Every structure is written in structure tokens, then in C-alpha cells.
Enzyme design. Sequence first.
Site, PDB file in Angstrom:
ATOM      1  N   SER A 371      44.109  51.866  31.506  1.00  0.00           N
ATOM      2  CA  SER A 371      44.993  50.643  31.656  1.00  0.00           C
ATOM      3  C   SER A 371      46.254  51.274  32.443  1.00  0.00           C
ATOM      4  CB  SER A 371      45.346  49.836  30.485  1.00  0.00           C
ATOM      5  OG  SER A 371      46.336  50.245  30.090  1.00  0.00           O
ATOM      6  N   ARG A 372      47.223  50.527  33.052  1.00  0.00           N
ATOM      7  CA  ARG A 372      48.234  50.555  33.519  1.00  0.00           C
ATOM      8  C   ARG A 372      49.572  50.393  32.694  1.00  0.00           C
ATOM      9  NH1 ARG A 372      44.502  51.910  38.140  1.00  0.00           N
ATOM     10  NH2 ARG A 372      45.878  52.603  39.737  1.00  0.00           N
ATOM     11  N   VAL A 373      49.281  50.203  31.338  1.00  0.00           N
ATOM     12  CA  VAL A 373      50.315  49.838  30.520  1.00  0.00           C
ATOM     13  C   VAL A 373      50.442  50.795  29.285  1.00  0.00           C
ATOM     14  CG1 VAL A 373      50.533  47.376  31.108  1.00  0.00           C
ATOM     15  CG2 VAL A 373      48.776  47.920  29.646  1.00  0.00           C
TER      16      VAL A 373
END
Lengths: 506, 57, 51
Positions: A371-373
Site C-alpha cells: 500500500s501507499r500508506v
Amino acid sequence: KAQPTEVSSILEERIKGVSDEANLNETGRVLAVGDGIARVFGLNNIQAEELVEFSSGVKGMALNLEPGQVGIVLFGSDRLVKEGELVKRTGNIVDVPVGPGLLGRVVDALGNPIDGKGPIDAAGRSRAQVKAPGILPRRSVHEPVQTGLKAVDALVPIGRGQRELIIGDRQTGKTAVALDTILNQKRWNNGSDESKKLYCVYVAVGQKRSTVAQLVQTLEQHDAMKYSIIVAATASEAAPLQYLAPFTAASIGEWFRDNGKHALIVYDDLSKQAVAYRQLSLLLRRPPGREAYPGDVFYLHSRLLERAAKLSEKEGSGSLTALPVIETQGGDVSAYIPTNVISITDGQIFLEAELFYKGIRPAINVGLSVSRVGSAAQVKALKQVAGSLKLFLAQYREVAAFAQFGSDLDASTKQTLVRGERLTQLLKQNQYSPLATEEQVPLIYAGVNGHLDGIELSRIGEFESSFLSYLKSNHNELLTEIREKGELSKELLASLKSATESFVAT
Amino acid sequence: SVLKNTSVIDKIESYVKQYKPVKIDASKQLQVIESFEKHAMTNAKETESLVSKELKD
Amino acid sequence: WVRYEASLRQLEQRQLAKSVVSRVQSELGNPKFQEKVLQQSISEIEQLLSK
Ligand SMILES: Nc1ncnc2c1ncn2[C@@H]1O[C@H](COP(=O)(O)OP(=O)(O)O)[C@@H](O)[C@H]1O
Ligand SMILES: [Mg+2]
């Protein structure tokens, strides 16, 4: 009854007024029909993607505008329409009711009430095809989304505004994790702070009506139907219904987002949406682009999922968290539709069939689920404990594969291997069991900090329940402090360390 | 307001009105529990005294 | 009881639908053509004149 009489009189007065006003402003003669796509003459100055009224009663919309003939995809069964039927145009772009009245109501792709609970009260009508917000209107994903899975979904979060993908084979838990997230959102939408409420909206596209009926039954069993919209197109209706239902769900999602509210949308199994577009394009005279798929499938996924975004404070700070779901065949994430959707999303959640058959009900592979978080858009308590635990688990998997390759200083002698196996066994969950964020930090903290060396893999399942009971019975102080603060400080870290090495002996 | 032809809301209202006093609460943990506790402190003080004098010895 | 009343409303609605279609079939038999033809011919004439 009294209401049907007056409603009918008013609407037929409006019908006579429409018929007596500007003739009908354009018409057409049906030239061909089939598979939910209809050719029609006339409609010289018809708008693009414009709703059209058919004499039989079926709805339509204009994907193609050829010289003379107009490509209309049929919104419903094509049985009613025949050759020569008059095709009135509605005069407006394809719209769908959007507003707070859709809460607790099930509607079709067109937004008409299908649950039979009454008319839909909408603040306005939004176009099914809406341009996604720009760079400046978009905002960095910082507000967490409480997935409530007690798994990798927590250590690597979703957050408000991410389009976190859910890949995997059929019957692997994609709908399961979606419904667990929807149920867990109840704890935050049952209050009064609108900045934390997550008004869910489901997209049950390509889902049998029995399955969606069971899904809505489960939702209202847990009192989750009050905040969830079930706008969808089942397998009974035509392909254009399937193609448009997720876009109108996106319209509802932007209405929630453009009003400053936060909405979670789960595009359940977009594969049937893609193949419905295939069915439209095959007989709408659009040549397929690649692998019998028309090229515009990537574009449609782009416009549909990029509408999901976290708005900035100038635009109202709204969020439109998206949970796309794809049904892959045999775990082939390298197929076309996978490749596009993994490239369309902000990270993915892999659900392989082998893990589901092994016994892990979440069945999520830590190695590929990115994910990008990472350590961002989280609570903060979980982000400090497991901000980089995914890489450690992936390395554990690689070394365990390496450990079986040759007999060396590996296996139980490897602290990294032991910690990784204990954490992987930790990351498990039962369906219909939404777990709050407060009862997730101690387990992961015990896993990451090497406190599970002497607990054994088989006993970790009992250790989870014992540790949670320990916190919720005689250590609620630090648990409630974490819950209310949304972060573990030096005091909270010390208290959690105290609890974990006090309970490590049991 | 949800129900129009209720014909039952008055009946259930009356039934709950007459049901709240289900019965008298027991609250009678004072016949064997009290005796157990009395013996508890008595021989507990006895044991405290004996362990104390054993420690001094 | 509330869902029973909802089912009652649904069955009343479908009975109203059956009554409506029965009356439509009745209108398909009785001589109810010339008067309505004149009426909506005048309606379309007025529609043309209004523009
Ligand atoms: N603890 C659990 N977690 C997840 N799924 C479970 C669990 N126990 C049983 N199941 C079964 O797993 C199935 C999940 O299938 P689902 O993911 O909805 O299929 P699809 O991926 O095609 O939507 C359910 O039908 C349910 O019966
Ligand atoms: Mg499903």
C-alpha cells in the site's frame, strides 16, 4: 391508497405538460437490438452519454454517436423493445439520485428504488460520469480507515481516500473483508462527529440476487444498513446495468465526498463490470484492443477509481475511500485485468486460495500486499508498532523458503524466522467479528518486539484471546488511553511493555 | 408512528408495564457465605499467629 | 408487526395494480375512443399553437 392517487395525478399532469412542451425535442427509430445494445436512427443532435426513453419503457444511454445511426446500450431487458420503436431523449446527461435519503435504501444502477421501501429522496442528481478531482483538490491520505480485521489490514492500513485493492481468487474473503470493514465502520458512524463517520456504499455488481439479499440481511442484522447504500446491478439485469452501477455508486460517493463527509465505497468484483463493457463493445462496433478486451477498460477503471480521493480542506476535507475487488482465475495476478487494476489502485490485498484452504480465514499474503500508506494514514498506535513489519514478514517468508532449501543456522534457531512465523499466525480473524483498533496494538507489539519467542505457534491462537481478555478485564487503563488518544506515547509504550512482559509468563 | 393498524401496541405496552417487577431479588448471601467467612478470618488469624511465632523461632 | 404492515402495504399495492389492469381491459372493450380522440387532438392542436 391516498398517496398513489395524488402521485399519479400529479405525474400524469407533468407527463401531459412534457408531451405538449417542445414536442419531445428529439426522437428516433430503432434499427437493431441485442445483448443490451440498440441501434437507432434519428437523434441528430443527441447529447453524448445521454439518457433516452423508449416506447416500451426500457432506459438507454448513448456510448456511440455515428453519422445517422446512434449506439444506444439498453438499460434493462431488450425483450420489450422492437423495431421501429420511438426513442425519446430525456434531454440530460445520464444521472443518478444522490443525497442522504439513499441511506438505508437499495437502488439499481439508474438509482430507481428496487428494495421496495418507497421513493428515494435525493438532494440532487449527479452525472454517472464525473471527472475526477485535480491535484490541488486532492489531499494526502492522512485520516485512518478502521478496517477492523486484526491482520495486515491494520499494520499496513487503508486510510481515508485510498483505493486499496482486494485481489484474490473467488471465495477467498474479498467480500468477507469488505463486509467486516463495513461492520467495523458502525462504531464510528454511530456517534455524532461527522468528521469520523464513514457512510459506506456497496457495489454488488455481478452478484446473484440471493447473495446480495443475504448480504443486506447480514448488514441489517448488525444494524449496518442505516449507513450503507446497496446501489448495485445483479446478474439478472442486462450488461449496461452492470457497467453503470459502479459509476453511479461513484457519483453517490462524490456527493458524500463533495459535502465534506467521508464515505467508503467497495467496488465488489469489478470483473463483471469489465466483461459487461466487453458485451457492450462487441455489438456496439468498437473493436477489442487486447486479449479480446476493448482498450477502454483501463480508461474506465481509471475514471471510476480515480474519482475516489481525499479532498483538501478548501474542498471540504471529504474522503471517498475505495475498496476495489477483482476475481482472478487461479491466482493469476499477471493477467490483463489484474495488471490494469493493480496499476490503477493504491496498493492491494492479496487473498490466495491456498491460504484460505490452509485454515487462515483472512488468507492474506503479506509478501505481495502493499500500500501507499505504510506507517501513514493510520491511528498512530499501530503505525509506530508495525510501521515496517510487512518487509520483515516478507523477509521471514524468504528465509523460511531459504531455510527449507538447506540445513544451516536457520529454522527455530533464527529469531527472525520465529518472530515472522508467530506474527503470521497472529494475523488471523473470524468473519462477522469487527475488532476495534484498541484491541490490536498489544498483539502486534508482542509480535514485533520479540515477546513471542516462547509462546509456540499452536498456542498463539489462545494467546491472542487471553491477552485481549487480560486488557479488557484488568488492564483497561492503557487500552482506553490508546483508544481515546489514538496514539501510544512513552507512557503508553511503557504501560504496554509492562502488560506484555507481565502476561508473557502465561 | 411507524405502525398504523397496530391493534397490539397497547397489549404489549400493558404486558411490559405489568412485567417489570419480575420477582424479589434474592440478596440472601448471609447463611452459608457468612459462616464460611467467619471460619475464614478465625483460623486465618490463627495461622498468621502460628507462622509469625515460627518465624521468630 | 411493522414488517407485516409493510407486507400488507405491498399486497394492497399489487391488488391495486390488478384492479388497474382489469379496468384497462374493461376500457379496451367499451366505446371509449372517439371522445378521447377528439380530446387529445384538441390537446395537440393547443400544444402546436402554444409554441
Ligand atoms: N472466518 C471466516 N472468514 C471469512 N470467510 C469465512 C469465514 N468462515 C467461513 N467463511 C466463508 O467464506 C466465504 C467468503 O466468500 P466470499 O469472499 O464472499 O466470495 P467472493 O470472493 O466470491 O465474494 C463465505 O461464504 C463464508 O461462508
Ligand atoms: Mg462475493
